């Protein structure tokens, strides 16, 4: 029935019309690697991992693909364990394929497998990419979330740290003075900054309403930092996107670095780890907020996570994080037919992931095979 | 799926023991198992186990929890046991265990792979004993139950301290040390008995000996802080938390450093999705964790299940997965299940739901007559 | 000067084992090497080398790093390994080694002069093993290629714990014990097998052994309190960060004090510079610092290099340098550069660039065919 | 090179000032300047400057330092820098920086190439300034004098404080702050003035002002834990470290959080590359290095070498390498080198060696006349 007899990979590419950035400089291109597994009874079932293409590719054409075909598409927890040990990127993929195998082969929506959901409906903030390489990029950053917010989002994430203190505060009192206080805006960093850097913003935190977080202002090699800015800082501090599992957010949560952890499904290893992300971070009374700068795909499974998480307060219409919802020119949102409403995600509820990986944007965006670069 | 919860029949068991045994808490008198039976629309149904004081237990059932659950979904696992939890945490786990079995069944699927599918299919165990017996020659009567046991295959046994003076406790242990040798592995239960002196106390003896596992709750956990001390000052493991009620009772004493081994048991915590968390909260934090299992038989074939689906705990080809306590003490309900270990080996069931049938008969014949014992 | 980079090659190398060899992790099934070639105007070059899943490795040189390389100034050290790492942190490596000998050729001296002058020209060894190997008699194995190696006048060898029981470990070690006798040092490599319970079992054949060396990297790094919890309980020392990037990783461990002995290896570190800063943190803190290499030749050299640039670390006049890690398993790759210990001390070379020459008999024997190994 | 050190040449120079001005520790009243020049066997040669009291100084380097150094390897930089740095201290980093001149000279590079290559050419400066005069008009002269320089272009200062009352400081600062505007960075040096209670004083003003670049040394560093108590309680970042020997003394402050920023000072710490080693130190750990330079010009160029080695602090592309100090008080010797800010930046020199010449005009007319001031 479930011996794995055929994978199907996609490496996907788009190079982008306007480029936009961070702290980090200037995107030029999005990526995707999608990745379809079949069983001998017909039963397929969908990954999608990022990472640089011509690496990514000949690791599962010469590696993966070679073990895990004839493998029992049931053992899930052994093969991603096995995988991940020499490649996490591809981990994450093949996990979520024999999930939504799994949840076929027992008739039911993949929340359903997990235990069933606590909630239909998930909250997202948009997600910018603000810097632009134009002398003009604070009006276009304005205009970018203008738009947006016309849409109904009420909360918004966009870029700090990549220029002085000066250029970007004005910029973020440009996008206050627009947004105005109803607005939740979160502020990223990048990890541009030390703690003295990051702490010239707090003259701004005390005085504005509506910040949500401070998203990891500082690198994670000192935990003791973070301890040491939070406790200065009048806002929550966030972070933790490139940590690979529950394993790495221990000692950060025991040494009380962050409010809000921030895992990537295509970071850790697995759906299965990336929820234990998610429930640790409840034990440890910390809030959770999928971070999916990459994901379309893997995005509906962070949504499907946070439907299977319960609340984090009592409050009766604030007890959700939400998820990240990249809103830049990415033609890889549409790989799903799933978009917010008013920065409402309303989860599919039919079996498997209850929608359709859709192949006119995988073949529209097939890559070439040749690096930019 | 959509379908509903239609009826729940429980099950109250109770034995009384022939011959009393204990531990430092004193001597026990009897046995007792709660079952339940959770029916769907469909037909399908699956049972859970649990355990307290049985007319409490009864009453929360029939007068709130069964209430509670008629005409809910049985799909909704997660968010039925969280408001249950709240009500009576005892029952959580029974309900948790039913509605496992439920979806296991309606995916027609064994429960390991409803999980993610097992690591392994044996899990090794101990013998756990209550050595305490109301006799002066209570020692010898220790001795020879601990041999009984050995000849069946069991490399590692539980027996009790912290009941009786330090010199006697030695006594007991030394005699079971000269029949045992140093090839049996020893845990020493002292069921929170001690202060961090008394406890110390056994380490002139912890420094000569090879074959001690673990130390079991010498202390209290009111003051973690006094678990770390201990640990570190200590040449034995030390273990515990078996009355924790999940995963975030547990963060604390890890992130504290207080224990090499932790406890959980599937009817002490909150359901047993959260028993499965505090097991791999217990590898995120690089600590192992073997369930502990006094009462219990079907609760216990889910510890079991659990622990197949556990990753190991080191690179040892011969020593990557914990022990699971093995109660050997009188107590028909060992039965309920059909299943025992050889050789100090459990293998697991593969079919489908839990693999397993109850055992009906001893069902009736233990049924409680509804009277408490006093 | 403003000389630029105009060509670069690239050597793929792949050698299958005759007979398999292992550690906790496992059994090794090949070697391979990669080594690079990076050409100046002038025509001054230099190499390096590194280490990763060859189809991966290859395909980042040709399509990314080295496009990028082209017609940059090889004099941009600094600038270009930092950019480099970014994208790829196994190729800085090997970019930096190629850049510091194009820097010693054009500068008309060595490395170690380019560094500001050696502190000594013989560094110590030691000898070390991939014990396991698949086999009922692997030990005698084991005991049989120490003892060759301790013919050719090894001081100190390094063997591998953790990749089975703690009883048949120990009983490897004793045998050990028995051939080398006192006077041999021996470091046990756990390889990240352990909690701190099971590393604490060795404490009591430390206390009694006097010729135990340290304890190498018997836990995961996550949790560094419990490496300083461990450290504080044995009677040897203990040693680790054999994979940390570079030098930001190790300060929060010696910070905590986590280690004794840090051991960084050139081909897992942000290239050559941050390597030696590896080197001073330690010194700074007031730890010592041996280089860790299981793979490596080039790059070995490299770690000796930089060691015998190292101040001393002890006032003691004959016991100031730390030891390297020497690789004795089948490894036709120690030959790529013509450079062996004598009664395990390594005389470094002292001509200019690296002093010596890539053999390229060995780079052209062993060329990689493309194909992965299944 | 095995090229030998044939000759070495010393120059004490004195100036008295024309009008005093000084700090929390008083007024100065002269500036003084110790140049050597060390003349290998080829005939390459190197310039160093140290600073301390001029008839102990040179004494130091006349009967011990020369002595030693004559037929001594050039190449041999760490190791006689060492030596060196047990007796003498001061005299070590006017050395190291010979010998570095020496080393880039035969290897026909710069200094910064030697290191690896600059990651950049420009490197911005702050005017220093030591605020105190003996006059009751003071502040006005402050005022004016600070003045001149923002009309030369710097955009960053640093003033003293601590010396007088918290009331006429702040007088002081108020009349700086309204002369200069929220565009000029602002540092206060208080030199070791303060307790924590005295510095946290300021924190009501700092509360208000935006253009405050640090609060510098405001405490004495016997009890680390009060800079981190302090640090921890200010709106503004604490800087200090300016008397630190080197990155061994740093790593205790920096494990505790005690500082935003170090100050090492080419001429306080054990040489040149020991100086690196306290800037890439402060990067690991994530703080901040701004170099210390009230005396220096010589050593101020290396100092400025070193910055332009240094990778970005953060990722911001106009604000991601920290300024260094610039002496704008009247001494003659600033003009050792022929090296200015233009509008608080310090272009590099790019040329082989240090890339400028020593100027012999200034050099001969203060020689010191070998009295000892009053
Ligand atoms: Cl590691
Ligand atoms: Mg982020
Ligand atoms: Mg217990
Ligand atoms: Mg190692
Ligand atoms: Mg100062």
Not at 195 to 217: C, D, M, V
Not at 256 to 275: A, K, S, T, W, Y
Not at 307 to 312: I, Q, R, T, Y
């Given at each position: 029935?479930?011996?794995?007899?055929?994978?199907?990979?996609?490496?996907?590419?788009?190079?982008?019309?306007?480029?936009?950035?961070?702290?980090?400089?200037?995107?030029?291109?999005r990526?995707?690697?999608?990745?379809?597994?079949?069983?001998?009874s017909?039963?397929?079932?969908?990954?999608?991992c990022?990472?640089?293409?011509?690496?990514?590719?000949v690791?599962?054409?010469?590696?993966?693909?070679?073990?895990?075909?004839?493998?029992?598409?049931?053992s899930?927890?052994?093969?991603?364990?096995?995988?991940?040990?020499?490649?996490?990127?591809?981990?994450?993929?093949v996990?979520?394929?024999?999930?939504?195998?799994?949840?076929?082969?027992?008739?039911?929506?993949?929340?359903?497998?997990?235990?069933?959901?606590?909630?239909?409906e998930?909250?997202?903030?948009?997600?910018?990419?603000?810097?632009?390489?134009?002398?003009?990029?604070?009006?276009?950053?304005?205009?970018?979330?203008?738009?947006?917010?016309?849409?109904?989002?009420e909360?918004?994430?966009?870029?700090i740290?990549?220029?002085?203190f000066?250029?970007?505060?004005?910029?973020?009192?440009?996008?206050?003075?627009?947004?105005?206080?109803?607005?939740?805006?979160?502020?990223?960093?990048?990890?541009?900054?030390?703690?003295?850097?990051?702490?010239?913003?707090?003259?701004?935190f005390?005085?504005?309403?509506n910040?949500?977080?401070?998203?990891?202002?500082?690198?994670?090699?000192?935990?003791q930092?973070?301890?040491?800015?939070?406790?200065?800082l009048?806002?929550?501090?966030?972070?933790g996107?490139?940590?690979?599992?529950?394993?790495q957010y221990?000692?950060?949560?025991?040494?009380?670095?962050?409010?809000?952890?921030?895992?990537?499904?295509?970071?850790?290893?697995?759906?299965?780890?990336?929820?234990?992300?998610?429930?640790?971070?409840?034990?440890?009374?910390?809030?959770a907020?999928?971070?999916?700068?990459?994901?379309?795909?893997?995005?509906?499974?962070?949504?499907?996570?946070?439907a299977?998480?319960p609340?984090?307060?009592?409050?009766?219409?604030?007890?959700?994080?939400?998820?990240?919802?990249?809103?830049?020119?990415?033609?890889?949102?549409?790989?799903?037919?799933?978009?917010?409403?008013?920065?409402?995600?309303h989860?599919?509820?039919?079996?498997?992931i209850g929608?359709?990986i859709?192949?006119?944007?995988?073949?529209?965006?097939?890559?070439?095979?040749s690096?930019?670069?």
């Amino acid at each position: 029935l479930v011996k794995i007899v055929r994978i199907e990979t996609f490496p996907l590419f788009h190079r982008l019309e306007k480029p936009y950035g961070d702290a980090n400089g200037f995107k030029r291109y999005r990526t995707c690697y999608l990745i379809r597994i079949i069983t001998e009874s017909g039963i397929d079932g969908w990954g999608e991992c990022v990472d640089w293409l011509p690496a990514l590719h000949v690791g599962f054409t010469k590696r993966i693909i070679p073990f895990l075909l004839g493998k029992q598409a049931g053992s899930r927890l052994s093969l991603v364990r096995t995988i991940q040990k020499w490649h996490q990127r591809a981990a994450s993929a093949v996990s979520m394929a024999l999930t939504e195998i799994a949840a076929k082969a027992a008739d039911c929506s993949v929340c359903e497998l997990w235990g069933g959901r606590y909630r239909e409906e998930i909250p997202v903030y948009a997600s910018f990419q603000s810097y632009s390489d134009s002398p003009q990029w604070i009006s276009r950053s304005v205009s970018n979330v203008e738009a947006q917010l016309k849409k109904g989002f009420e909360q918004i994430k966009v870029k700090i740290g990549g220029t002085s203190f000066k250029e970007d505060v004005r910029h973020i009192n440009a996008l206050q003075h627009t947004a105005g206080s109803s607005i939740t805006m979160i502020l990223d960093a990048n990890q541009s900054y030390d703690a003295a850097a990051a702490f010239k913003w707090e003259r701004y935190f005390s005085e504005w309403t509506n910040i949500g977080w401070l998203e990891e202002p500082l690198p994670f090699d000192q935990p003791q930092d973070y301890a040491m800015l939070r406790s200065r800082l009048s806002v929550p501090v966030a972070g933790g996107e490139n940590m690979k599992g529950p394993a790495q957010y221990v000692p950060l949560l025991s040494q009380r670095c962050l409010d809000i952890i921030q895992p990537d499904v295509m970071h850790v290893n697995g759906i299965d780890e990336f929820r234990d992300c998610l429930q640790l971070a409840r034990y440890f009374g910390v809030r959770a907020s999928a971070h999916a700068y990459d994901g379309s795909l893997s995005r509906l499974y962070a949504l499907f996570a946070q439907a299977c998480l319960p609340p984090w307060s009592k409050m009766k219409n604030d007890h959700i994080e939400p998820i990240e919802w990249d809103v830049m020119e990415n033609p890889f949102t549409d790989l799903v037919s799933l978009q917010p409403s008013k920065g409402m995600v309303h989860i599919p509820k039919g079996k498997g992931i209850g929608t359709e990986i859709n192949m006119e944007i995988v073949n529209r965006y097939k890559w070439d095979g040749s690096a930019y670069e």
